[PDB]
């Protein structure tokens, strides 16, 4: 199953400074394009190599859209102020996530469209691409406005047709590239003892995509109790890292095995100290 999303943000600036708008496109969770109003030359720029294959007609068309959306947020961000009795100039943030999933049959699975004011949900388009879910009494004014204008129907179109159409295309442009996988280079480290206990840390470094599974076991039985794990983190070079640790009762070091499961691995790794 495949998908495409566009995370957009418009953050209000303290002063008379026009709100900063930023848009990021994502194909199969990989950022592929990006627009930012702060740039000297605000334009939608390639964010993945398989995207450079697009001609100027594309980049100008997309940039036009981003500049229209830029003003769309300037207004709505202005309206939310009223809706929420907010003042003249403070820090205000509005973001929207839209896109579409494609099942295994390459036919539309789900379409998305949702907003959030100040990091909290505001209004989402239900899976029927017709009705809305307003989060609070404020979002009621917008929903009723969007029910009046028949806004939902116009997002149903983009979602079922243009989003689906264009995802099929980027998927074709980024074949092997999006499907590439870098295998983790694992290793285990040893750390000083607390009278009657030593820490065993299993490291998995240099992998892509981010999804990885690390496990510490004892004599075969997986010990999940008191296992320390870090949230997967980017190395900064496009790969990810992570580690699993267990404060092990010394002497019994070799009694512990670590497995690493990653899509890039031909066989899951097993390691020990």
């Amino acid at each position: 199953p495949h998908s495409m999303r566009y995370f957009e943000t418009a953050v209000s600036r303290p002063g008379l400074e026009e709100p900063r708008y930023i848009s990021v496109g994502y194909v199969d969770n990989k950022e592929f394009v990006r627009f930012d109003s702060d740039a000297e030359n605000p334009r939608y720029e390639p964010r993945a190599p398989w995207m450079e294959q697009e001609g100027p007609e594309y980049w100008e068309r997309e940039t036009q859209k981003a500049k229209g959306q830029e003003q769309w947020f300037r207004v709505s961000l202005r309206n939310l102020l009223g809706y929420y009795n907010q003042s003249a100039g403070g820090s205000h943030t509005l973001q929207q996530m839209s896109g579409c999933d494609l099942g295994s049959d390459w036919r539309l699975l789900r379409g998305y469209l949702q907003f959030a004011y100040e990091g909290r949900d505001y209004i989402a388009l239900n899976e029927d691409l017709k009705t809305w879910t307003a989060a609070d009494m404020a979002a009621q004014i917008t929903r009723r406005k969007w029910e009046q204008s028949g806004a939902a129907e116009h997002y149903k179109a983009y979602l079922e047709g243009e989003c689906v159409e264009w995802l099929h295309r980027y998927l074709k442009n980024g074949n092997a590239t999006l499907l590439r996988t870098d295998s983790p280079k694992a290793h285990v480290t040893h750390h000083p003892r607390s009278k009657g206990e030593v820490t065993l840390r299993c490291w998995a470094l240099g992998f892509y995509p981010a999804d990885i599974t690390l496990t510490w076991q004892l004599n075969g039985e997986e010990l999940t109790q008191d296992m320390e794990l870090v949230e997967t983190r980017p190395a900064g070079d496009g790969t990810f890292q992570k580690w699993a640790s267990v404060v092990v009762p010394l002497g019994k070091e070799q009694n512990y095995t670590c497995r690493v499961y990653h899509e890039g691995l031909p066989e899951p790794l097993t390691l020990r100290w």
């Binding site: 859209k65 709505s76 839209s98 406005k145 264009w166």
Partner: peptide, 9 residues
């Protein structure tokens, strides 16, 4: 292909 025209909030 990015989002387009739409009614305000």
């Amino acid at each position: 292909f990015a989002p387009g025209v739409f009614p305000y909030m």
